[PDB]
Design a protein around this ligand. Sequence first.
Ligand SMILES: CCCSCCCO[C@H]1O[C@H](CO)[C@@H](O)[C@H](O)[C@@H]1O
Ligand code: NI
Length: 158
Amino acid sequence: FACKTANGTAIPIGGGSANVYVNLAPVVNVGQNLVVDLSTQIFCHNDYPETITDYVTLQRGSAYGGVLSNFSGTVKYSGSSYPFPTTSETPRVVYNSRTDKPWPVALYLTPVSSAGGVAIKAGSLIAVLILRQTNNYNSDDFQFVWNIYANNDVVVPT
Ligand SMILES: CCCSCCCO[C@H]1O[C@H](CO)[C@@H](O)[C@H](O)[C@@H]1O
Ligand code: NI
């Protein structure tokens, strides 16, 4: 089991960590969502699907910088919705193919009432999402840690 990002980097067998940049709508009002869809960027696959079944959860989602201070959020993982930052590990998604399949995580962030001005800075760390991977074959229990960075400033109209 391993993961990579679209035109980007890879995390190899056994787990590890990688930095991911995201495009964000440059202006967002109170009552609107920033939708950060990671499923177009993070792709994983199973290395021996004929004999092994891989299990993948979102173990935790944390907020950082302007997201932590200026937004409230939910995370959508494989069709279900949860508070972001998260309160517990999600159920599992099955990976059973050598073919790249997306990691189905999306963040919906909405500006808090105190948010105003540049609420997220270009280049800043905004989130960490931890993918946890196990199987039906051995004791493997690995973490794939995704550091999420803002590509552009996001302004909350005052
Ligand atoms: C015919 C199979 C012989 S075992 C091959 C061991 C390879 O294990 C890697 O690949 C497995 C399947 O993706 C993972 O479950 C495991 O965690 C690790 O990433
Ligand atoms: Ni592979």
